[model samples]
Target: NKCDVVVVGGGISGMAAAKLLHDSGLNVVVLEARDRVGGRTYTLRNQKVKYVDLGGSYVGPTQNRILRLAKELGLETYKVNEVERLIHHVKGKSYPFRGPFPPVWNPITYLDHNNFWRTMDDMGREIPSDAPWKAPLAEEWDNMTMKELLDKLCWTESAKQLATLFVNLCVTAETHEVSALWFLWYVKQCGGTTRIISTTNGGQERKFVGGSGQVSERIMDLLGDRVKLERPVIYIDQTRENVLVETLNHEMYEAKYVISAIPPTLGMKIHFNPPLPMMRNQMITRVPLGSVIKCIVYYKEPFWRKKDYCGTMIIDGEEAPVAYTLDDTKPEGNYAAIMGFILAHKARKLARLTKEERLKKLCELYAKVLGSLEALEPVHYEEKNWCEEQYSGGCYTTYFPPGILTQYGRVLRQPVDRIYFAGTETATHWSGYMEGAVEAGERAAREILHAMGKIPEDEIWQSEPESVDVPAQPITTTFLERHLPSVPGLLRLI
Candidate 1:
């Protein structure tokens, strides 16, 4: 059925856009390619076990938009245990130095010797507690890469390598690919990454009651029959008068306006009518995205955590481990989960391997981390290969090559005719995050409303403000100011 707006994609962005427009008296129809909603955000029941989150897990206390909706929907959440974090691996070796953190050599001395804590505190203080995204040095720092900033601090090779391990764990990409500006902004948003270290373990870190699936379910519930599932859009010809949307099945729907909320990689696959402008063509094709393979393994018991392990590991040496985080399974204490992430080239290759080969390599790597094959046992394991998914194309996105963000990042989000774009990538703050997905979607909906004069510009919500804060931790001189050395021919951890 035709509607005032036809939202393509059932992920958080698409659903949020559809919901807002519909609530504002617009006839909004949502078309999701997958049979289920929550495109990249999913909680599934596989092989007859309890619910498990396959994508977009963990909402922070400051993740206000998601939290507000969860509360509104009567979904329950719990704080994750952070103090229990134990170092799992080091620069290509299991903690070589003797200390409080066994298998984590020099943990105490490193913590004691470095300015890591002070710098962290300094960063935390630099972040305006309330305005996380408003970079005081926005213009100046925007041009600086993460490597450049770290070099100014004099971080030793080893410490810098470890720092890479920690940052890469969460962002799931190389430091060279990320902007120091973005990283600093993130530090401002979460209050303090130190205080957020509980994030390091990823245990009980604020998840929706039942599962994160409840989030998509709540959004889909509001749409009811308004959402059309299992119909993937293959082409679109948008104009000032109307937009003609056609699915792979050849069914077509019309709308006055359209929002392309799909990820950049997938968005590019669709053939746009009359062709897109030159800049848009480059933006769609050159936009850099991450190909992280988020995997979930269900075990007979939570053996990894019980062994005083937080399941967070970093391989600083050549050829890093394929996985990180022994995420604690909730409600059912007998289970655990992990994400085998590889970014850039590493991820691209791993994603192409056979599923069985991928699983086998993962098992071999886990055996090394635990120092035993015993920790790898489980009746079955599952994975959501977003990289392989025809609709998504990639799991999440990261800053592109040098000039992309400063040059074209803002342009990517600009409106074209009756067409507007919103997704995690379009979000200026918290880009490539679930928070960004919701934030961008809401903004696009309001933009359409304003275009139609349905709402005053002052009354609409701009992108929700989020703060990023890095916690104060005991500093170590070794890692505080290091540069990416040309260790050519060596594989770096993603």
Candidate 2:
């Protein structure tokens, strides 16, 4: 059977594309490998007190795409618990710090920290989110790994460790792995280091009431039976006129256009009949997804909050396997929870250990960080190792290593005949987040629409206005007969 568009991978990107195409009066079908939607945004809530995001969650203020969709879908969001303090664990010792920096950081280390941020911000501002290769020093930056950058700067030991943690948390890969250019591009997409790392006004700030996955769930419901589950496309044969997609079980799908919404790493596994371009093949083959296992520990109460701690902890040393954690307690929920990200090397190491051993290690780490033995005795402990999932090779998103971005990055999103690409990785803004996925989907859909002549080239995906214009009147005239003398002129103007 043939449709106008066949969206592969029923994640946020695919669903968003499918919705747009379907609304545009085109016959669209979505083929998803997993039984469920939301892709990396998986919300685990079978026996949960409320919900715990096992995959991608949290939307910041600037991430308007997913946030708008959530509101449109009748989904509500709540702020993550404010971080009162953070326990920075290093070398078998934990240091509680009130502010952002680690407690034991010296004057030299502090200078290095500020210098690193300023340098990154400066370089990041110069790099374009969509085309990092076009930057002035792109070749130089792309040729070096983040580790090399740190080495060149001669960052202090403590600062180096902190930088490593930053890279691991952002890309889900170590500093020695990803290209410096790619790191800067990622930072640019996320706004900046401060915006990406902060919890209050940052990317990790707010979460959906039920779970982030509910946004995709609602979109899927709107698409109805147009979405097919467990339909993994193993092969794709695209020509000048049509694209044929074949599942592992021999189910065939044909479409005028195809949106490959899966990650590039996973896309490399799919067999292309008329082989992709050398650059495209090289791009996908080189890009790798980072390993991450999300673990949520539910307590009887918000114990850390009671102790004036925010349940935020970072373990930078090799002794602790869990890299980072945050307060994941839900508003109006029966229990409190802390969500942790076991990242990169640690996640791989933990994956090899026995479940009992891993659990014991996590319990001990929580006790040390939360400063309470009660944390070890949580009401429930849940974990999802995304690496274990067949469809999703890893959590968060994929990354470009040294020399890959500048070499084959231009073809990363270039369409091959009738086959197109749309995923969070393809997004120019907010690239590793759920918002990026939606943005990519919208762009892909609009591209297809323009290609099909359904929309003009100038008419592409336009973001919905965040708010309607409200005619402003003088505050004094609107509220009171007399002007408030204390009110600033700027405030009155607003």
Candidate 3:
């Protein structure tokens, strides 16, 4: 097979890449390893009759480019029902908690607990409105974990729990390992730190009218047959005049340009002829995917909502079977579809158990957090083990321990020779989110067009108004050590 461009991985990134390239009048070919599209944004379509996102679930509108795209594509969104209220489970106790929202009053000053308004004001007072991730300070807090940052504040148990777990839910190998710097940076990337806290009715965090899968369908419609499925690029040989991509079934393809719109960890598994530069190789080996599994429970009715429950809970029961459960079915008031998020390491242990045991564990988590599991009895259950998926391998990107905003991460985005990277990880404004995938795809498409003399090198493609600052290299002959750590069992250079 051959074309003007070959896109590896048919996730949103690759879909967007192929769409942009094809629209540019280039012969674009996309190869997806999975049977379906959406990659991490996939959903479970079982007998429950409701679509449950097994991977990336929540889409925040405040700054979500992906959600904005949905509206542009004529897709409707269901407002997330997390605003009503939330519960925190810690060490076997479920406590009601809200926030330190700005402009709000905090009567209880004990560790700033019970003060939603005061905390928001203090947060606003921290980093400058503009240039939150700029040089000089962008990398300043890269080494601190979210846990460490919260500990420094000595916040009351409630405030601390809300800040660390709720905000940095995607950080750390587990919820406990995340640093505060990375958590805050992630919060900033989404918007102000307080927005996620407020259950503002009009904010973005929403789902599609049907399911997120519809977004993928619309994107495919835009690209048509260019988005090929079940075609894995077994090899990428850039040593030849045209890059040759071999598939898993011993098929081969040649293209003028190639973009591996997948994670570098998976990228390392595929052969790259003439190989990528040393730093790029090291990036693949060092950057690890923070994994998690989403478990959805169907209930007979929205009982929790009947009692004014927002369906958000942090499980700190005897054995926290679930970390968090948010109301998935909403706005339209469908049956209770409380969604649970479990970590990869923890999920693997559960996976080894019998089906009965897994169900018991889930019931225990829900019963303890919500005061009763009987209400959660459902028509069926579903889950997708991201870590176990050979294709995606893990959920959306999460900055590994100590890799938060490090120099190595910056290196991961740079292209070497003719080979370029374009996964969500390479995105600046919203790295690790669906928006990042689109941003990366657009950037890669523009890069290729410029190389082909189709567009000027200085042309900007990002629709979002973000000013990203690139840090200068340190002046030294000795290879200065960076904060980003290495993952085991992969290629490493330098």
List, residue by residue over 1-494, the lDDT tens digit for candidate 1: 57888887888888778878988899998878988988778888755456777777777645556665566667776543333444446544543222222331354334332444345445546545324334465545557666666665533565566555545655656767766655665554444444333453222255665777777778889879988888898888875367998888778989988888888757776788878777787877765555677666556665656656555554455465363554546644545555456544466667667766767777667667756566566556777666667777666554454344445555667787777887777664445667667777888888899889988898556634432321123323234323222222112432
Best by lDDT: 2
Candidate 2, superposed: residue stretches over 4 Å from native: 98-105, 461-494
Error of 2 at 208 (Å): 0.6
C-alpha-based local distance difference test score of model 3: 0.63
Positional deviation of residue 185's Cα in model 2 after best superposition, in angstroms: 0.9
Model 1: how far residue 136 lies from native, Å: 8.5
The predicted structure with the larger TM-score, 1 or 3, is: 3
lDDT (Cα, tens digit) per residue for candidate 2, span 2-83: 8889999888888888888888899999999988998899887776555678889888767778777778789878878875
Candidate number with the higher lDDT (2 or 3): 2
